Structures are given as structure tokens and as C-alpha cells.
From a paper:
Although the majority of the tegument disassociates from the capsid at this stage, three tegument proteins remain capsid bound: pUL36, [name], and pUS3. Like pUL36, [name] promotes translocation of incoming capsids to the nucleus. We recently determined the crystal structure of the N-terminal half of [name] and identified three evolutionarily conserved surface-exposed regions: R1, R2 and R3. Our results indicate that the conserved R2 region in the [name] inner tegument protein rectifies this motion to produce sustained retrograde bias.
We previously mutated three evolutionary conserved surface regions of the [name] tegument protein (R1, R2, R3) in [name]. Each mutated region consisted of five alanine substitutions. Although plaques produced by the R2 mutant were smaller than wild type, all three mutants propagated to wild-type titers. Remarkably, the R2 mutant was avirulent despite propagating to wild-type titers in culture. To determine if the stark R2 mutant phenotype resulted from misfolding of the mutant [name] protein, the crystal structure of the [name] N-terminus was solved and overlaid with the previous WT structure. The five point mutations did not affect the overall fold of the N-terminal half of [name] as judged by the alignment of the wild-type and R2 mutant crystal structures (rmsd = 0.55 Å). These findings demonstrated that introduction of the mutations did not contort the [name] backbone, and encouraged us to further examine the R2 mutant in cell culture infection models to identify the specific source of its avirulence. Whereas wild-type HSV-1 and [name] capsids preferentially moved in the retrograde direction in axons (towards the neural soma), capsids of the R2 mutants moved in an aberrant bidirectional manner best described as “ping-ponging”. Firstly, the [name] R2 mutant failed to spread to the TG following inoculation into the anterior chamber of the eye, which was consistent with the HSV-1 R2 mutant defect in vivo, and pinpointed R2 as a conserved effector of alpha-herpesvirus neuroinvasion. Taken together, the in vivo studies recapitulated the results obtained with primary cultured sensory neurons: R2 is required for retrograde axonal transport but is dispensable for anterograde axonal transport.
Author numbering: -1 to 477
């Protein structure tokens, strides 16, 4: 514990010698001990009083940097459990900026207005917590999205939390963990909103709409039953032309696959949440021959995933959707091209398996389906993490590093150059963190040191090269 150690140290007295206290401060300046909000709150008043007292009984430069920027130095390594939300951080800030902090620093001849001082930190972390609370006010459950399928660009996910006003907070651990938390709680809803929009799209055919309904039930509701989803599926299913089913008594009429069993059990019962058949229960399966495409909409043929995966009988047209996926320059673009075309997360997984089983001798039309599904499965892995922070940089790097071992052997067969898959994923999902903020925080902390040096009549101080080496290590170790 950095604050804890600092308190023990400065408590040893010996304040009548400047360098003994000047070393105990330089240690903390570079210590690694992470803090907790309750732990800072419980130690703040004493730690700040010590700092203030170390500077009143030494006058040295490092004591004054420590006291003036103790607020930001202590926040920088704070580890917060974001399930508790902002209130523990506001409560902390309340202690940091209380009247005893201003009296302690004022009475010591120091400032309250350093960039990482109690005034700047209280004002800025308060605005940030306010932005955080606002970013979490969205849809709490899938039922909310189904009622209001608002489409949120993931490019906007947590963006108010990394605006320039908060540049000097950006490298703090609790900020980076909060971006991660916000991403985790917002991005999942976009594929659901896009699917709900198709299911409710009155310019699509009933079979198309009925299948989108079933993908929604399976990806986002499992066994939790939504009455609107039930109502939507039954209305579309009841209007599906009976010409789309294999008639009873034909060879291979029975549903052949886990997918076909699930689609058939729902249609037969008019119930999205029926997924099995009673052994002996007669269920018509959907045709998977090229003719059944006439019952689908041209742009979303893959939403009938059993037909699109029946490659020896049927070739779905995925050239248009591959054109849009391959030209996508943002998360919103690529996810919207994927989901509206029927390349949900599960369909990407199934169509990737069905096409790569034909490798290396693919036709151009199959390669279009396989590129869409392959890129698609990477996008769906990345989407829930997409954000402007270091966590998404970590998550993207881990996913990108798996692409060559997964697909190095089949990219030529798909018509892609070497690293073709990484090329497309980078173009629409590459991390876009405002890394300039790292430099802004370092500049700010070092300006405060500069002021301390000049105040102490120094062209250079020990505090500078120590804080420098701490910040310099974090910028390389993290970013
Ligand atoms: Ca945490
Ligand atoms: Ca907790
Ligand atoms: Ca927790
Ligand atoms: Ca709790
Ligand atoms: Ca077949
Ligand atoms: Ca066959
Ligand atoms: Ca075109
Ligand atoms: Ca997979
Ligand atoms: Ca095989
Ligand atoms: Ca993770
Ligand atoms: Cl988290
Ligand atoms: Cl098959
Ligand atoms: Cl096949
Ligand atoms: Na603003
Ligand atoms: Na590696």
C-alpha cells in the first residue's frame, strides 16, 4: 500500500533533517502499491497533513510536489470495484477536498490549485463520475432493447469519458477500468437492436422476419420468455408460405440438424421458445434447396442458415454483404452489415465451419460466404469489448494474434492475401484510444514539478527525474 507505506514512513518523525524525509517521499513517488477508495479515504487526512508537515519542516521540493499533487498521485493507482458505481469515489473526493485539506496546505504555504491537487481532482473526477453515471443509464436488459431498439455506435461507447477535459485522468487505473466496465455494459445491445429492427421490418418477408425472431430468442433470451418476441414470431410464422417447408413423407423430410430441429419445433408450435420435438411428433423442416431462396430477401439469405450451410445443394448470394463488410471503416458499419444480412454470432460460427470444411477448393461464391463468416466471428468476439481504453487494446491484441494460427492455412483458399483477415478486422475494429492523453498527464505532472523547482530556486530537482521515470515506465509498460 503506497499511501499506507507513506504514512508509516513520514510518521517516523526525524523531520529536523530534510534528506531523510526527502527519500521517504521519493520512494512513494515511484512506489507501485495500488490503493482502494476506502483505503485512501481512511488515510488521506493524515497523509496530507504529513506531506504538508514534511514541507513545513524541510522546505524541500519533493515534499511540496507530494503535498500539492497528493490527490492525483493517490488517485492514479486507485483500484475501484465498479459494481459499486460512483458513490465510493464521490465520498472519497469529499474527504480529499474537505476544509482540513485547504487549511493544511494553505497553512503550509502551499497551493490547493496544482493540476493534480485537491481542487482539480475534485472538480474533474466529479465531472467524470457524472459522465460515467450518464453512460450507464442505457438499456439494462434485453427486454429493454426489444421495446426500444436504439442503435448506439460503439465508436461513441464511453467517449465522453475520454474527452480532452479528462485528459489528465486517462492513465489512472480506475478510469481505465471504468471504460472497460462501460463497454461491457453497452456494446452487447447493438446486435440485438439490429436484429429486432429486421424482425419488425415490414419490407421483409415473413420467413426472414420469423428467422430473425428465433436468432434473437436464442442469442439474447435463452429461456427468459418475452411476450412481444412470442407475439412477433407467431404473427410472422403464421404468414410464412407453406411452400417453404419440405412436405411430409418426402425422403429427408424430417429435420436433419440441431438447427433444423430447433427451427421446425418453433414453426410447428408457433412458439419461438419451443426448441425440441417430442420423438414421434411430425415436424416439417424448411427447404434448403436453391428454390427456397425465393422465399427470402436477397440481402439476408444467410438468416436461413441451414440453407446457406447446405453447400452441395444451395449457393446463397453473399457478394453484396462481403462488399459491405470488407469496406467497413467502423464497428457500427461492420456489425450492421453483418447482422442485417443474417450473420449473427451463431450463423457466423456455423457458416465458417461449413465453408472451411470445403477448403482449399472453394468457389468464389463460397469464399464470399466464408470471408463474411470468418471476419464476422472475429467482429462478434471484439464487439462487447470495443472501447477507447487500454483494455480494448489488450483484447484486440489477443484476438489479432490468434488470426494467423487460425486462418493462415485458408486465406489463399478464401481469395485473401496473407494476413487478409487481420487487414479487414483492423480496418473496422482497430483500437482508437486517445493516447495523446498519456502525454498530457505527464506534461501536467511535470509542469507542477517545474513550478516546485522554480519555487525552490532550482533549474532541476530530484522529484523531476523520479516522477519522470515513473511516468516513463507506465507509458511503455502499459501503452
Ligand atoms: Ca475493478
Ligand atoms: Ca464490492
Ligand atoms: Ca464486484
Ligand atoms: Ca456491493
Ligand atoms: Ca448437404
Ligand atoms: Ca452431401
Ligand atoms: Ca456496390
Ligand atoms: Ca467460432
Ligand atoms: Ca468434413
Ligand atoms: Ca476481458
Ligand atoms: Cl471492470
Ligand atoms: Cl446439410
Ligand atoms: Cl453440404
Ligand atoms: Na463536455
Ligand atoms: Na504472439
Amino acid at each position: 500500500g503506497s499511501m499506507e507505506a507513506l504514512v508509516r514512513a513520514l510518521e517516523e518523525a526525524d523531520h529536523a533533517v530534510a534528506t531523510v524525509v526527502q527519500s521517504r517521499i521519493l520512494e512513494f513517488f515511484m512506489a507501485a502499491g495500488r490503493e482502494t477508495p476506502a483505503g485512501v479515504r481512511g488515510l488521506w487526512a493524515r497523509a496530507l497533513r504529513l506531506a504538508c508537515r514534511a514541507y513545513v519542516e524541510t522546505g524541500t521540493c519533493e515534499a511540496a510536489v507530494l503535498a500539492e499533487n497528493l490527490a492525483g498521485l493517490a488517485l492514479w493507482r486507485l483500484r475501484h470495484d465498479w459494481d459499486e458505481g460512483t458513490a465510493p469515489l464521490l465520498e472519497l473526493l469529499g474527504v480529499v477536498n474537505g476544509d482540513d485539506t485547504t487549511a493544511a496546505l494553505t497553512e503550509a504555504g502551499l497551493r490547493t490549485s496544482a493540476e493534480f491537487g485537491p481542487d482539480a481532482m475534485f472538480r474533474l473526477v466529479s465531472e467524470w463520475c457524472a459522465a460515467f453515471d450518464e453512460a450507464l443509464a442505457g438499456a439494462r436488459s434485453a427486454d429493454d432493447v426489444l421495446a426500444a431498439p436504439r442503435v448506439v455506435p460503439p465508436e461513441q461507447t464511453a467517449r465522453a469519458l475520454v474527452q480532452p477535459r479528462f485528459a489528465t485522468l486517462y492513465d489512472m487505473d480506475f478510469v481505465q477500468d471504468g471504460l472497460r466496465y462501460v463497454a461491457q455494459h453497452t456494446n452487447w445491445a447493438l446486435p440485438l437492436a439490429l436484429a429486432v429492427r429486421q424482425m419488425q421490418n415490414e419490407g421483409l418477408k415473413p420467413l426472414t422476419r420469423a428467422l430473425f425472431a428465433l436468432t434473437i430468442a436464442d442469442e439474447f433470451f435463452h429461456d427468459r420468455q418475452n411476450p412481444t418476441l412470442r407475439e412477433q414470431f407467431a404473427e410472422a410464422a403464421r404468414a410464412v408460405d407453406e411452400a417453404a417447408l419440405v412436405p411430409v413423407g418426402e425422403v429427408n423430410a424430417t429435420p436433419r440438424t440441431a438447427v433444423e430441429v430447433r427451427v421446425s419445433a418453433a414453426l410447428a408450435h408457433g412458439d419461438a421458445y419451443v426448441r425440441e420435438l417430442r420423438p414421434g411428433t411430425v415436424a416439417r423442416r424448411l427447404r434448403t434447396d436453391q428454390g427456397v431462396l425465393a422465399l427470402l430477401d436477397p440481402g439476408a439469405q444467410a438468416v436461413h442458415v441451414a440453407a446457406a450451410a447446405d453447400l452441395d445443394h444451395t449457393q446463397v448470394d453473399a457478394t453484396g454483404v462481403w462488399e459491405a463488410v470488407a469496406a467497413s471503416a467502423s464497428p457500427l458499419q461492420v456489425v450492421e452489415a453483418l447482422v442485417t444480412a443474417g450473420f449473427t454470432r451463431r450463423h457466423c460460427d456455423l457458416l465458417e465451419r461449413a465453408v472451411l470444411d470445403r477448403a482449399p477448393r472453394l468457389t468464389a461464391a463460397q469464399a464470399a460466404v466464408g470471408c463474411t463468416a470468418v471476419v464476422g466471428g472475429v467482429v462478434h468476439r471484439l464487439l462487447d469489448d470495443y472501447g477507447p481504453g487500454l483494455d480494448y487494446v489488450r483484447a484486440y491484441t489477443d484476438v489479432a494474434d490468434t488470426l494467423e494460427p487460425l486462418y493462415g492455412d485458408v486465406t489463399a483458399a478464401l481469395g485473401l492475401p496473407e494476413k487478409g483477415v487481420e487487414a479487414v478486422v483492423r480496418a473496422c475494429m482497430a483500437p482508437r484510444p486517445p493516447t495523446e492523453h498519456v502525454g498530457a498527464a505527464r506534461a501536467a505532472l511535470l509542469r507542477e514539478v517545474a513550478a516546485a523547482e522554480r519555487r525552490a530556486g532550482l533549474a532541476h530537482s530530484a522529484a523531476r527525474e523520479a516522477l519522470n521515470t515513473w511516468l516513463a515506465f507506465r507509458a511503455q509498460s502499459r501503452w
